[PDB]
RNA sequence: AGCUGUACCGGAAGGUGCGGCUGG
RNA sequence: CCUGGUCCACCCGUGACGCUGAGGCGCGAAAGCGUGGGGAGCAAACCGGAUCCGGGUAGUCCACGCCCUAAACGAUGCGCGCUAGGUCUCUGGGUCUCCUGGGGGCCGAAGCUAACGCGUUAAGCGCGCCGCCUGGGGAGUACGGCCGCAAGGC
RNA sequence: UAGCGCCGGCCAACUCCGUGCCAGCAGCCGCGGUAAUACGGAGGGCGCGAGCGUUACCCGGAUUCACUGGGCGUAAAGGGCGUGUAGGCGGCCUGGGGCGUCCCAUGUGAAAGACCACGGCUCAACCGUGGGGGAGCGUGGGAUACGCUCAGGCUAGACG
């Protein structure tokens, strides 16, 4: 503790939203808000961090899934400062159960990217070039970061297990361990390694992700 | 390594703008007669495509049967929808006593001696699913001991 | 009103297991204590303890579950898959030594209230006595 | 709009009075 | 004015005095009947018009007796125990923005269902008692019995 | 001495010729109006065999009276409601009785039939010898966990 407290990690959602299954992590209630038990957060963090350290040491691959408005930039920067891929724009339905199909799009993006940097572009008059530019821009926006996955990942890291329930379902279906920075309105049972924290509060996500990536880098 | 046989072929129809469109459904069981079984249902415009898809599906939905002396460890009754299956162990030299669907499922699982029964609705698809569910819910002495004592 | 206390305990336990609670509370009785002792000895439940709820004596039962599973629906396997009441008020079931049922080829147990107290099927058969078939557990 | 209990039809491929229901 | 049921607080008294209920007894929308009154409006049957409108008796109303049916429905018998919550609303009590009872609805965990859906007001998990079903039509018809003045009901 | 049924699916076993909603088949689905492996004949093939088919009756499949082992919101099925008689069922803490319940011993449960073993007809049907098993009931002796009854206590149901 003493590092989490100032980051506002232990600030949950209102009484209106709380998931009953999460009740085992509530310390107390104050001022119409819920409070997460710092201690439990601590040992859960220790356990999950041990798991991530072991996986990194073994040379595994972790996918980062954060789509929430404030978390996009954080996920981007934190993921780039490591070899691990990420998804931060919008989780296309079927990145895991339909990995081959999305790999087709990865191949398509690769081929376009190669083509634009080739001296054979003098064909295909300006308008077709503009159409291809639009296509390339779209594929770059949506499929960037995902391009690193040559195959199925080894684990998944999700900022919000509820916002990204589809990704959770896919990972569960394909026996991929799940790491989540859950809050008062999440389902603990659907996550193997859970970090009870905050999904808003940029500070909290910054702290947690920075620590995680530093642990990743250190163990390589 | 895996041998294949068909549960049933059916042809379904859907209305369109003045006409009927036919799609074929196949129910396929796969096994090795060693204590592993799989079931799949494949829907396709054409029969070969349906068979291929059904086999393809069955190859992942995989179940290990805890065989012992080529018979089920214990009796079990299982309800799926409006269908009921009853399975009971048999002494060596009894044979598979089952309908078409249960016999087909159990033979590929390596089961040699069992007494079965179908109750309620006897729709092949639901019977097959009930059989698979019943197979999935089987335990041995070792498993029970491990869970209880630890 | 409450007609069958034993059935009440059975349903309470079943409802507790089906939602994965760590413990449950039940009204106190000697016969119920005996049933829970039999269950604990066979390693179906983590164990029972006599407590007091706002004046009235109760028993708190600590339940046992399986390890966390993988894939969709990671809810662990139950230890008490199925518990059923055999002898009910309005239709009592009494069986001799020769008619003692075998539950799940010995994988399960059955509780007999015999002249020599509450026993399982195995020990009841061993001591060579019959009685009232309370409930079956597997 | 349909259905329904009841009570009547000497211009009864059904009609009307008193209610009731959505199985509109 | 007389009177039934019910809820909450105090936790003061009795110490199982409880649940259900074949028959019986009572209640039972509307329509309908009898012995008397009453009759503004509306209105079966009926009197006329162009082929819906204008009148109009019983009836609708009151007192006392009968009749005892229905989409008499939440198409869900009664009592008790257990099983996540969120929201709206009616009515009580407290240490008053919340906590704790008793009703009426809406979304939904687990679970159940053939599905639609139900889901602490269960159609879930159970126990106790009563009623009812055994393919459609013939048909709630025929004969018999009981009730009723009759239509008719069981 | 070799016959009888069947050959569309259920259900084992396919091709010609005759007729064209006619003659017919049919246990259910249905087949027959120019192709019909479904009618009649022939070739062939399945099944049984000195037997093979048909009709009538009983059980099964029928979990389709559901004790084992069903149900009642919309498929058939909650009484139009209340009060309540008989009946059915019923909180927890100690005792007495031992009716229900359980156990032991013994009598009976004839013979034949069923099961097992051995044996005699050249084998088998058939028969013989021996051994048990057997629901239930009588007598004598034990146990009190549950139901029952008789005593006492409690407040969590109910009532005030």
From Swiss-Prot, chain A:
Gene Ontology molecular function, alphabetical: rRNA binding; structural constituent of ribosome
Pfam family, one: Ribosomal_S2
InterPro entries (alphabetical): Ribosomal_uS2 (IPR001865), Ribosomal_uS2_bac/mit/plastid (IPR005706), Ribosomal_uS2_CS (IPR018130), Ribosomal_uS2_flav_dom_sf (IPR023591)
Top-level taxon of the source organism: Bacteria
Entry similarity comment: Belongs to the universal ribosomal protein uS2 family.
NCBIfam families for this protein: rpsB_bact
Swiss-Prot/TrEMBL keywords: Coiled coil, Ribonucleoprotein, Ribosomal protein, RNA-binding, rRNA-binding
PANTHER family, per database record: 30S RIBOSOMAL PROTEIN S2 PROKARYOTIC AND ORGANELLAR, SMALL RIBOSOMAL SUBUNIT PROTEIN US2M
Species of provenance: Thermus thermophilus (strain ATCC 27634 / DSM 579 / HB8)
GO BP field: translation
A GO CC term assigned to this protein in UniProt: cytosolic small ribosomal subunit
Coiled-coil parts of chain: 98-143
Subunit text: Part of the 30S ribosomal subunit. Contacts protein S8 and may contact the N-terminus of Era.
Keyword Kinase attached: no
Protein name, entry field: Small ribosomal subunit protein uS2
Task of the protein: Spans the head-body hinge region of the 30S subunit. Is loosely associated with the 30S subunit.
UniProtKB/Swiss-Prot annotation, chain B:
Alphabetized SUPFAM superfamilies for the sequence: dsRNA-binding domain-like, Ribosomal protein S5 domain 2-like
Pfam families the UniProt entry points to: Ribosomal_S5 (PF00333), Ribosomal_S5_C (PF03719)
One GO process term, biological-process aspect: translation
Protein name stated in the entry: Small ribosomal subunit protein uS5
Function according to Swiss-Prot or TrEMBL: With S4 and S12 plays an important role in translational accuracy. Located at the back of the 30S subunit body where it stabilizes the conformation of the head with respect to the body. Binds mRNA in the 70S ribosome, positioning it for translation.
GO cellular component: small ribosomal subunit
rRNA-binding in keyword set: yes
Source organism: Thermus thermophilus (strain ATCC 27634 / DSM 579 / HB8)
Family statement: Belongs to the universal ribosomal protein uS5 family.
Sequence ranges assigned to domain S5 DRBM in this UniProt record: 2-65
Curated annotation (Swiss-Prot), chain C:
GO annotation, biological process: translation
Keyword field contains DNA repair: no
Short name of any one Pfam family annotated for the protein: Ribosomal_S8
GO annotations of cellular component type: ribonucleoprotein complex; ribosome
SUPFAM superfamilies membership: Ribosomal protein S8
Family annotation (InterPro entries): Ribosomal_uS8, Ribosomal_uS8_CS, Ribosomal_uS8_sf
GO MF annotations, alphabetized: rRNA binding; structural constituent of ribosome
Complex and partners: Part of the 30S ribosomal subunit. Contacts proteins S2, S5 and S12.
Entry-linked HAMAP family: Ribosomal_uS8_B
Stated name of the protein: Small ribosomal subunit protein uS8
Species this chain originates from: Thermus thermophilus (strain ATCC 27634 / DSM 579 / HB8)
Lineage of origin: Bacteria, Thermotogati, Deinococcota, Deinococci, Thermales
């Amino acid at each position: 503790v003493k590092e989490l407290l100032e980051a506002g990690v232990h600030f949950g959602h209102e009484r209106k939203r709380w998931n009953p299954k999460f009740a085992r992590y509530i310390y107390a209630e104050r001022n119409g808000i819920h409070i997460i038990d710092l201690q439990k957060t601590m040992e859960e963090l220790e356990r999950t961090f041990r798991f991530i350290e072991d996986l990194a040491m073994r040379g595994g691959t972790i996918l980062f899934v954060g789509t929430k408005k404030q978390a996009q930039d954080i996920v981007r920067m934190e993921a780039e400062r490591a070899g691990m891929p990420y998804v931060n724009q919008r989780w296309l339905g079927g990145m895991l159960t339909n990995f081959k199909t999305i790999s087709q799009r990865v191949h398509r993006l690769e081929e376009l990217e190669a083509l634009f940097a080739s001296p054979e572009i003098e064909e295909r008059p300006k308008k077709e070039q503009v159409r291809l530019k639009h296509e390339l821009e779209r594929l770059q926006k949506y499929l960037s970061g995902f391009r690193l996955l040559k195959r199925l990942p080894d684990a998944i890291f999700v900022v919000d297990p509820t916002k990204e329930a589809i990704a959770v379902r896919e990972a569960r279906k394909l026996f991929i361990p799940v790491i989540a920075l859950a809050d008062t309105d999440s389902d603990p049972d659907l996550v193997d390694y859970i970090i009870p924290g905050n999904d808003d509060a940029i500070r909290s996500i910054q702290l947690i992700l920075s620590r995680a990536v530093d642990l990743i880098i250190q163990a390589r | 390594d895996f041998e294949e046989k068909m549960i049933l072929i059916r042809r379904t129809a859907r209305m369109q703008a003045g006409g009927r469109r036919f799609r074929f459904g196949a129910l396929v069981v796969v096994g090795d007669r060693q204590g592993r079984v799989g079931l799949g249902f494949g829907k396709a415009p054409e029969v070969p495509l349906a068979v291929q898809k059904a086999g393809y599906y069955a190859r992942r939905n995989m179940v290990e049967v805890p065989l012992q002396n080529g018979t089920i460890p214990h009796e079990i009754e299982v309800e799926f929808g409006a269908s009921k299956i009853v399975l009971k162990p048999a002494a060596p030299g009894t044979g598979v006593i089952a309908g078409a669907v249960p016999r087909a499922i159990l033979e590929l699982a390596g089961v040699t001696d069992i007494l079965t029964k179908e109750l309620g609705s006897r729709n092949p698809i639901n019977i097959a699913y009930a059989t698979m569910e019943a197979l999935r819910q089987l335990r041995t002495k070792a498993d029970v001991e491990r869970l209880r004592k630890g | 009103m409450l007609t069958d206390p034993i059935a009440d305990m059975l349903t309470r336990i079943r409802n507790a297991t089906r939602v994965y609670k760590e413990s449950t509370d039940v009204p106190a009785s000697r016969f119920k204590e005996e049933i829970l002792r039999i269950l604990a000895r066979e390693g179906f439940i983590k164990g029972y303890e006599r407590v007091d709820v706002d004046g009235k004596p109760y028993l708190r039962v600590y339940l046992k579950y399986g390890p966390r599973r993988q894939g969709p629906d990671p809810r662990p396997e139950q230890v008490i898959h199925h518990i059923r009441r055999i002898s009910k008020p309005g239709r009592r079931v009494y069986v001799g030594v020769k008619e003692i049922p075998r539950v799940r080829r010995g994988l399960g147990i059955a509780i007999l209230s015999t002249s020599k107290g509450v026993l399982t099927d195995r020990e009841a058969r061993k001591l060579g006595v019959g009685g009232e078939l309370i409930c079956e557990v597997w």
